[PDB]
Amino acid sequence: ETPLEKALTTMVTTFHKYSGREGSKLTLSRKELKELIKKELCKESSIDDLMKSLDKNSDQEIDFKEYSVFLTMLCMAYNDFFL
Amino acid sequence: TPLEKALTTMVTTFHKYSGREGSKLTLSRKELKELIKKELSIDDLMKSLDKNSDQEIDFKEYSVFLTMLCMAYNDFFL
Ligand SMILES: [Ca+2]
Ligand SMILES: [Ca+2]
Ligand SMILES: [Ca+2]
Ligand SMILES: [Ca+2]
């Protein structure tokens, strides 16, 4: 309906358009995360550094809460460009 | 990239409402109540989000709101 609701909707579906390609469909592996960004945001394994930043449980996959934190970092940054 | 357009909606919506009164960088109770009603009680949500008890929602605090919503949307998606 409203652009905000449509925004939220994109965040949740985008997660699942990539998490279900391999392994648990609930978690983005390294590969799924790399496909995610490259195709949906703006690429060498500095994915590694990100993985590290986001992967709280050191299980080497990004679950949905963990992705939620990525989305936040992005918003904070989009917010500063905005000013 | 829709994702990007989504993140864009996140920040501009905040600012579409934060600069109406008081600091242009925070949402008062009134601005918050505007956001939400036009874009999707408050007292109990204020209490939830207002980490510093200053009675304004700064951008980080709004961030925690957006997360709450995604967690939810993620459920209705299952
Ligand atoms: Ca997966
Ligand atoms: Ca993890
Ligand atoms: Ca304000
Ligand atoms: Ca506050």
Q: Which of B5, B8, B10, B60 to mutate against chain A (most A CBs within 10 Å)?
A: B10
Beta bridge partners of A62: A28
DSSP A20-70: TTSS-TTSB-HHHHHHHHHHH----TTHHHHHHHH-TTSSSSB-HHHHHHH
Residue type, A24: S
Q: How far is the CA of A81 from the centre of ligand 3 (A)?
A: 19
Set out the domains of chain B in order of their start, with CATH numbers.
1-78 (1.10.238.10)
Beta bridge partners of B57: B27
Measured CA distances, B78 to A16, A24, A25, A29, B30 (Å): 10, 14, 11, 19, 33
Resolution of this model in Å is 2.6
The kind and range of the H/E element at B26 are: strand B26-27
From first CA to last CA, the distance across chain B in angstroms is 24
Evaluate whether B14 touches B8 at the Cβ level (below 8 Å): no
Q: Which of B1, B38, B70 sits opposite A68 (nearest CB)?
A: B70
Torsion of the alpha carbons at A15, A62, A52 and B2, rounded to the nearest 10: 0
Q: Is B58 helix (H, G, I), strand (E, B) or coil?
A: strand
The token pair at A16 is 């699942």
Q: Choose among A36, A46, A43: nearest CA to A11.
A: A36
The token pair at B75 is 């459920």
The token pair at A1 is 């309906």
What is the C-alpha separation between A38 and A45, in angstroms, rounded? 12
Q: How far is the CA of B27 from the centre of ligand 4 (A)?
A: 9
Q: Identify all chain A residues contacting B2, using CB atoms and an 8 Å cutoff.
A: 10, 14, 40
Q: Is B16 helix (H, G, I), strand (E, B) or coil?
A: helix
**CB environment B39-59: b (16+ within 10 A), e (fewer):** beeeeebbeebbeeeeebbbb
Q: How far is the CA of B49 from the centre of ligand 4 (A)?
A: 8
